[PDB]
Enzyme design. Structure first.
Site, short mmCIF file in Angstrom:
data_model
loop_
_atom_site.label_atom_id
_atom_site.label_comp_id
_atom_site.label_asym_id
_atom_site.label_seq_id
_atom_site.Cartn_x
_atom_site.Cartn_y
_atom_site.Cartn_z
N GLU A 1 0.76 -1.25 0.00
CA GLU A 1 0.00 0.00 0.00
C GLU A 1 0.80 1.30 0.00
OE1 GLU A 1 -3.05 -0.17 2.95
OE2 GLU A 1 -3.62 1.94 2.74
N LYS B 1 -2.52 -2.04 -3.33
CA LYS B 1 -3.58 -1.18 -2.81
C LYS B 1 -3.13 0.25 -3.01
CE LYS B 1 -6.35 -0.04 1.29
NZ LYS B 1 -7.00 -0.59 2.51
#
Lengths: 350, 350, 360, 352
Positions: free
Chosen positions: A187, A229
């Site tokens: 992420e 992500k």
């Protein structure tokens, strides 16, 4: 260079299988790993005391929604506390999730820390004793993890140091997760904060993702056993110029096509503070983009899936049903969105 | 690039002054930060129960050596436990050290961890919550820190990943230390294990140090407020070719001259398992080397300073005086060595 | 990794010996390697036709100054054309330079080219067939080379790309030079253009030099057989805040101590846009800076050594002696400066005070 | 952290259209840019004098093959000399190529040079004045270029320096090309020489390509306007262990999927010394691989397309038709292979 297999064929299959289940067609992720400190404002908005029991109740409410959410939810990310809590029937939350066909995820980072010498930039900590924590989380039901790095678009940011350091820490975290049978969700979030436009966000996103994947390669990361992500490519939150959802979708898909290797199993977009509808419409537009996308393009939303549910609940037990209904509605909406089937009712320019 | 001052003039002066005091002419460092696990073997060799009391007594024995060691010891590295222990008379160990004119140091790393995908290589952990720890240690008497990274010379090692990762984590550790008024001792140890010759060690040492300083630069590290704790350049333990102390000195000083910026306040050579005499003779030769050295070249020894002392003590409180006498003799020997005045009784080829 | 010796002890000795002779105590470099298009400008000011003969003559004027410059000049950088020209007595210029105890240098880069995707930034070309060119120049009397990279301070410059690419090309150039017995002068010039201040220039200089030496390390460059030609650390030419020579010297020496390994044989500063006096005064202050300096700190000036000379000559063959006299004066001044023994206060001339700055 | 557009929308469109035309469905590239020194070996194998006229005749023989090759050839890479030669009828070769539906390419690198301090490793030169050369080549009919970097698998190679330097030079070359309307074919060839096995080649190829694309990103290269010319992933020529075409295909596609962004318009595999038949079967197996491939997987073959033709010709004018027939047969075979429709007749995933 010489190879020294970081993973065996069996370890790869396990990781790959997990990654694919989470982002199977029509499925997405419920990001419910908020900490006491971050969920505190959520609860105080509905005049509900931030106690362990209320947090347990609220999480139970989302996790025990009817089977209509099963086809929509491939994974659920929990915070440490919640991983060890139980529903009113005594069933551990990880068990409640699995029984509904969902994979259990666990947040493992330990927050951001300031990078000295930068203009308010940060890196993320949480690598210490991470291996042992993963082995334990694995035994306790989790098959994937969450680690959030934060970058900001500014006059001189993100700097070369912030990009390099955040990319490197993400690779370390990924390496350790994979050694313990945990699928790491990478992420590298670029905040929407600021008055920058769509092209600026696309540019920075492209540069950040190229750095992220070079680091993953340097650290011998098995991409098929990971998920990405990222932030969608959008104009700054305070950008004067306005854009359509189609433009957002084009910038996003183009940036990803120019940086994310086909080997990556899937992309789970973060909501980034977007509203429930906005997040669903943009995801739908992303999936309808007429460009070739070699990876699943789905969701990993927090408030974009909980906003209305939390409000309907209002902290009152008699509002359980009404609250879960709102959650089911957003789960259904986003399940259709990640397939380009959601309806609320020149790429060279990129 | 754009400068966002990591440190203020005051913070710089503080770090620079501390660094200089530690490596003042004729002074070195007593590396006594062994953990219960690392001190276990040595206590076992002298038949002594590994208890906090014996450890406290042993450390007390070293820290309370007579005043002859004062001009020899500029700093003393302690393990967490020891930093909070007291001498029999009630004085906190940090106070004992300072009353003798020594600077107190603290080991802050949390040991090595394996790097997946490598031939047995590692990186070091310990960044989590390090800032708060440094602030706490500073408040409790520490002015500098130790953090050990370990690399090995082998068929395919040190690998590009290992060099890059270790250099980077060393930079993070240094950055955090300096934000809290703690002088970081950068330690990229290249083990002497293997059958490689002198030039192979010199080559690897040059490459590692070059990567270390580039990383320090990228992380905006204040070099004047740091110290370097490298291995001396020597052949591997299993190397059949023999070399003189002068050749070891030439290879060592040549490698440093090619990689270490003059701004670095001092170089405190790790003993790396060498014998008491060997470490002293080599340090002496290094300081007598003709080449120009813009930094202090001294010691930060473990067993090279404690060997004979530990043995003379043998766990017998009655041997206190005899044990301390051995330590004192090595402190004196190395004090002369770091000035090129110790006696037991073509550079283009580099 | 594994060591595959790029150089033999013999090759290292030759490179080290050359580099040391160029920057021996009290000695500096005369940068007279201006191209035709670059020197045409200089000949224009004095209303002199830019012909091969006038260029030959002018260069002869500098290279044949009286013996007082011998202890001052350790090296002379020439342009390709000049390396193959001769003095009126038929002596090849390289032989002239050598007979006066100087080492002959040669400019080998082929100029800068634009870096696409940047805000007016560049990199430098000239690697093609460089090995063969170096081998030939070596035979023709050259022992070291010059290669200029240019970086600029601005809102978004120098960018990560500009820094990395220029550091890398410099490393390639240095590698090829050393393979042919040629000492490479590493030149990462940071222009003084702009309104930034002293600390801004220092910050950028430190970052640029850190990148340069890491690249040289990656390319297995033998530092002892190299020289560094950096900009001094000064505020931007358009900066309003004033600084003393002591502050410029402190910033300059500090940036160097923080990035330049002791193994580097010497630092030969470029004058930039500084006047003849300014270049000398700053170089003197640098050498007087208290901080420890493990390398020779001298000069490699072009116009900072030729300004007054050109003026005195004016293109008149009859002003030969007068012209050379001015050059000699600056050579002596800088020879003292690179030893921290320069004290102006005299008749240096107005031309020696005029700013030699030219916008980029 | 700021953008300064290297290209405009119009420039990007032009580069993208060119790249796509070259690798359109069923099409590949005829690599015929051998130098005089390189072509000398070919001409000598058939006892033919190495003169400019013989070279012209040979190239003409290939370029003027009948219309059957039209749907098979998306591009033709020429050597500087050939770009300025003409067919018997007086038509410039670039015109001949275009009239048959092909795009004209030009080799622009200036060969490899040794990297000091390495174990016989090299980088490639040719950037000097490259921009002026591209502008001139563009004007004279060329739309894409070739630049070859060479890496070798050994005990200590490819080294960090070699990988980094070659990736960087390829990026500079691509950048200059795109500024002049020329689609750059990025060629980081890892030689098959040695006794290394399939896994080792795959590992090295993955690391090399990862470095290549990071460098392309650092230099702001427009990927949609580029093509990649990599080596297929195969065991070393001296490897004792044998592998099937399916394994070679899986290792190859796996390596690409793990490193090549989907934005890259196409991958044109170099033959790398493989026999004509082997190169077609491998390319076909690659296209049949049961994995998702977001880029065209075609060919850019030299000897794998000219071997038999050169032999049939033998340097005798009377063998022209027989020689052209051999080339045509390989063009048709590879056209089917880059579609996975190739047949001799003419009509464990996690272990990688």
């Amino acid at each position: 260079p010489h190879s020294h297999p970081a993973l065996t064929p069996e370890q790869k299959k396990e990781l790959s299988d997990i990654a694919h289940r989470i982002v199977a067609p029509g499925k997405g992720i419920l990001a419910a790993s908020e900490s006491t400190g971050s969920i505190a404002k959520r609860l105080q908005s509905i005049g509900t005391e931030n106690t362990e029991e209320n947090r347990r109740f609220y999480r139970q409410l989302l996790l025990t929604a009817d089977d209509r959410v099963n086809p929509c939810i491939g994974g659920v990310i929990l915070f440490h506390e919640t991983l060890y809590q139980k529903a009113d029937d005594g069933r551990p939350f990880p068990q409640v999730i699995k029984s509904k066909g969902g994979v259990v995820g666990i947040k493992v980072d330990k927050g951001v820390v300031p990078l000295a010498g930068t203009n308010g930039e940060t890196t993320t900590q949480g690598l210490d004793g991470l291996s042992e924590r993963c082995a334990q989380y694995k035994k306790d039901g989790a098959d994937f993890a969450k680690w959030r790095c934060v970058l900001k678009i500014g006059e001189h940011t993100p700097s070369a140091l912030a990009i390099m350091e955040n990319a490197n820490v993400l690779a370390r975290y990924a390496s350790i997760c994979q050694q313990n049978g945990i699928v790491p969700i990478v992420e590298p979030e670029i905040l929407p904060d600021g008055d920058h436009d769509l092209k600026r966000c696309q540019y920075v996103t492209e540069k950040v993702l190229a750095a992220v994947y070079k680091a993953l390669s340097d650290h011998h990361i098995y991409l098929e056993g990971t998920l990405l992500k990222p932030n969608m490519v959008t104009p700054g939150h305070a950008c004067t110029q306005k854009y359509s959802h189609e433009e957002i979708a084009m910038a996003t898909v183009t940036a990803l096509r120019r940086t994310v290797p086909p080997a990556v199993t899937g992309v789970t977009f973060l909501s980034g503070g977007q509203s429930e509808e906005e997040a669903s419409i943009n995801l739908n537009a992303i999936n309808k983009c007429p460009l070739l996308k070699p990876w699943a393009l789905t969701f990993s939303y927090g408030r974009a899936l909980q906003a209305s549910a939390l409000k309907a609940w209002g902290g009152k037990k008699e509002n359980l049903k009404a609250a879960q209904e709102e959650y089911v509605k957003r789960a259904l909406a986003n399940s259709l969105a990640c397939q380009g089937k959601y309806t609320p009712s020149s790429n060279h320019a990129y």
